[PDB]
């Protein structure tokens, strides 16, 4: 076993803390949210007497059969389960009724009153593990009957997706505005909780080596790639209305892009970083249909993976893409002329999430005896960072032009990091309202053209790389194979 | 065992080849030269019918005795090819500075050329002067007068360090040799230019946009070039006393590394364009003043394991000879203005180490004190390596200011490489005449001050890092300790 060492600041031990997880009976709350809160407790990042309240429409048995079922690190951290569950309560009610939250306010005040300490005006964090259509209703009820006492703050975590295009996303944002302002809203794009995504800023802005290189004077091409070997796996009916671009590219990969391309913030203040992400996204023209290649996977030739259209849930004649390569143009002084390629595909040759920065040739004096340097940042399956460079061939050579390619190799759930950040008031890794709308406007005209059938995906066998047209598209964009 | 696969070009199998090693009884020839020729043979880089002629004053009636007790003792990776190799080796006895002893060599070598399997008998001839420095001029004169090749064949002469002990003496040696051979025929050895990591500097710098874009004073704060050895003079301090650490390692080896690290990009990868750029860089360096150095001289190791330097009976008493030196150089050109270059070399210190350290400027914002200067390290000894020191976010659950330092790590004898190059006519890794004079002018004013006693070395215990004054000298130069 191990001892719990509190890493929490004293400033956070001043007031009671209540974390209300709406939808506590739903899959996300019990598969992601509560398991994360448990790991946070074991990491010593929750204040000592936090109150965690599960909230669902549907108690000590429930805490031990359904919640712990999805916990992890049990062969090493099983000694802390009961002390953690001592912090968990269950509250039954609806998600959209004012009086059900007045009851919660009394129930939470009952837990707030039990804090060891004089201050009873506790801080309150609401995690809406709810379907998106319930966000506005819950936010309205919380505001009307569950605000904190004087002194304590309130924060509301909501997760993507907020809409499926500019219109739908903007309407949800407008519905929540009357109830909470941006300093109180914490929108989750869970890629921002990944270690490699958070390390982009430090890599870029703490090191002169990377700072001096990170512009169009030296970079030829940037690629951000998501690959998976699996398909839709029967649930193609849910994927058919989403598509690969909305599922991974408009949200996740575009967040990676914003961090990869933004200007340096003068400080590490949360809003200064989000200011620079927004400022970059505003430099990006809408993606036209000439800057994309779409694909839709068929049977794997081995029979292992069936075709996408072979799922009975998928409407026949579907134009839904399971593969997409997109080229974006960033119109500013750092990036003018540099192609940015977003690639994402299901049922391709390997499982892989990575960034590839291709540098310009050093044309002289080596010419063909050199190759473009690259920086690769890989997140999945295995984390890695390395530089590809040209070095002389080891051993006895006849001339300096004998070279080879070699590498300089670098030697916690996402919700844990984001929930911890929310508790501290750090919104760096959360999507701001204006950021959400700019990103939607980059992709929405293409998404509308696709839905109207103007862009027909190219068939490719499951397990291959994707349409051959996509590889030629990438080469004609300025990437060298 | 393994089979010998000839990697030699047809152009080199067309004529006889003879390699005459003068001074074959000396330490270098038997510890370095002949062992290298053996590896070249095993590597298939000597033409099939090569003739190797050992040449010394010492008579050895039984040549086969000499070949098997003194020559083979220093061969390596032993063993299936030893005897076939020695069948290529001859012994010739004579003086180094008498014309008629070389007329005899010419008849001996011509007989070997006439025995070549092939119609052309006009062989190429390579002379390796594994001799003390005073014999270089005499031997070259005798070679020219009585041992030149036939019409078709070329002649090349390899000369070993040292070439002088200051600008004046070095210029005289070159002037004494000018009447006998021109630069295209002279191959001056600095054996560091035969090391793999020294040869890779050019490629690292100029084949890669990553390093090319960074390699200037906008981004580099400090450059350090370091030679370290745990051993001392090892009894033979009397020969070291007239040399000094600066002449032994710094004026030649480390200054060659400096030239390759700091030069401009050559117009092509031709030998003369590369040497041109090294010369043009060295001409940007003002002579080192005595305020730009710290000297040391090692004493007993405090544990008794390693004795003091002055405790050797070969070392004159009152010796001011330095066994340790840190030097600061200023490169006055647009790439390097303001960037300190530190040359460090010391015997009998804490570790055995040859490396380059390029310290980059701080990225001041937005991390400030939560970041540290990046570094590029290129290490040759004890183990080859190249790596970048960078700042990365602290793994795990952290604010963004929790960082740690991490690294991107890169994933054949020198005389073997240089002799192979000489046999092919590639003089890239050999010191050109003008290159020698520019390098001497950097160090000679300080060397004269040291010989006159104007700069007294600081005692330091064997096995420590060296004088404390040297470590403070480096901090005041602009280096930040990691
Ligand atoms: O080592 P490492 O894994 O970094 O080196 P590597 O395997 O050569 O990396 C492959 C890179 O080149 C692309 N690529 C792979 N096969 C290709 C093909 N047949 N045509 C065009 N592009 C191709 C990949 O694009 P994706 O990563 O988009 O496949 C990726 O950017
Ligand atoms: O691994 P790594 O080699 O990158 O990291 P490291 O060994 O921590 O860095 C060694 C560097 O620091 C210097 N250094 C070591 N001890 C020092 C001291 N007491 N005072 C001042 N400088 C000192 C060394 O100079 P030298 O290598 O010139 O001694 C070298 O440049």
Tab-separated table of N, CA, C and O and ligand atoms in Angstrom, chain A residues 223 225 227 343 349 352 356 386 388 407 465 471 479 481, ligand 1:
chain	number	residue	atom	x	y	z
A	223	UNK	N	1.864	18.214	-39.950
A	223	UNK	CA	0.825	17.204	-40.069
A	223	UNK	C	0.401	16.746	-38.688
A	223	UNK	O	1.252	16.477	-37.833
A	225	UNK	N	-2.187	13.841	-36.993
A	225	UNK	CA	-2.748	12.594	-37.496
A	225	UNK	C	-3.395	11.761	-36.399
A	225	UNK	O	-2.802	11.543	-35.338
A	227	UNK	N	-5.119	7.907	-36.188
A	227	UNK	CA	-5.381	6.651	-36.873
A	227	UNK	C	-5.867	5.620	-35.866
A	227	UNK	O	-5.434	5.613	-34.710
A	343	UNK	N	-5.209	14.767	-40.533
A	343	UNK	CA	-5.574	13.448	-41.027
A	343	UNK	C	-6.224	12.637	-39.917
A	343	UNK	O	-5.750	12.631	-38.777
A	349	UNK	N	-4.330	1.221	-41.100
A	349	UNK	CA	-3.322	0.178	-40.911
A	349	UNK	C	-2.800	0.086	-39.480
A	349	UNK	O	-2.330	-0.986	-39.077
A	352	UNK	N	-2.585	5.158	-33.904
A	352	UNK	CA	-1.524	6.158	-33.964
A	352	UNK	C	-2.090	7.563	-33.810
A	352	UNK	O	-3.005	7.951	-34.542
A	356	UNK	N	3.685	15.637	-36.828
A	356	UNK	CA	4.909	15.581	-37.614
A	356	UNK	C	5.183	16.961	-38.190
A	356	UNK	O	4.379	17.488	-38.963
A	386	UNK	N	10.935	12.766	-31.007
A	386	UNK	CA	12.259	12.588	-31.579
A	386	UNK	C	12.452	13.501	-32.776
A	386	UNK	O	11.497	13.923	-33.433
A	388	UNK	N	14.413	13.682	-36.436
A	388	UNK	CA	15.113	12.984	-37.501
A	388	UNK	C	16.112	13.934	-38.144
A	388	UNK	O	15.739	15.023	-38.598
A	407	UNK	N	18.174	9.475	-35.418
A	407	UNK	CA	17.183	10.095	-34.550
A	407	UNK	C	17.789	10.558	-33.232
A	407	UNK	O	18.640	9.876	-32.657
A	465	UNK	N	-4.088	1.848	-45.869
A	465	UNK	CA	-3.761	3.192	-45.409
A	465	UNK	C	-4.896	4.186	-45.607
A	465	UNK	O	-4.928	5.215	-44.919
A	471	UNK	N	-2.821	10.153	-50.165
A	471	UNK	CA	-1.364	10.232	-50.114
A	471	UNK	C	-0.825	11.178	-51.182
A	471	UNK	O	0.141	11.908	-50.936
A	479	UNK	N	4.463	17.995	-48.628
A	479	UNK	CA	5.110	16.949	-47.850
A	479	UNK	C	5.944	16.068	-48.770
A	479	UNK	O	5.538	15.771	-49.899
A	481	UNK	N	7.671	12.335	-49.077
A	481	UNK	CA	7.624	10.952	-48.595
A	481	UNK	C	9.015	10.389	-48.382
A	481	UNK	O	9.798	10.289	-49.322
C	1	LIG	O1	10.185	6.126	-38.278
C	1	LIG	P1	8.744	6.802	-38.707
C	1	LIG	O2	7.700	5.803	-38.334
C	1	LIG	O3	8.719	8.223	-38.235
C	1	LIG	O4	8.882	6.905	-40.342
C	1	LIG	P2	7.795	6.480	-41.507
C	1	LIG	O5	7.143	5.173	-41.187
C	1	LIG	O6	8.512	6.716	-42.802
C	1	LIG	O7	6.619	7.604	-41.312
C	1	LIG	C1	5.547	7.594	-42.223
C	1	LIG	C2	5.237	9.032	-42.614
C	1	LIG	O8	5.125	9.126	-44.040
C	1	LIG	C3	3.791	8.903	-44.430
C	1	LIG	N1	3.685	7.730	-45.299
C	1	LIG	C4	3.817	6.398	-44.983
C	1	LIG	N2	3.662	5.598	-45.998
C	1	LIG	C5	3.414	6.437	-47.053
C	1	LIG	C6	3.159	6.203	-48.418
C	1	LIG	N3	3.125	4.973	-48.938
C	1	LIG	N4	2.950	7.261	-49.210
C	1	LIG	C7	2.990	8.483	-48.679
C	1	LIG	N5	3.216	8.829	-47.422
C	1	LIG	C8	3.423	7.765	-46.644
C	1	LIG	C9	2.987	8.775	-43.127
C	1	LIG	O9	1.783	9.452	-43.203
C	1	LIG	P3	0.594	8.980	-42.032
C	1	LIG	O10	1.285	9.111	-40.677
C	1	LIG	O11	-0.497	9.997	-42.314
C	1	LIG	O12	0.313	7.553	-42.468
C	1	LIG	C10	3.868	9.565	-42.115
C	1	LIG	O13	3.677	10.938	-42.171
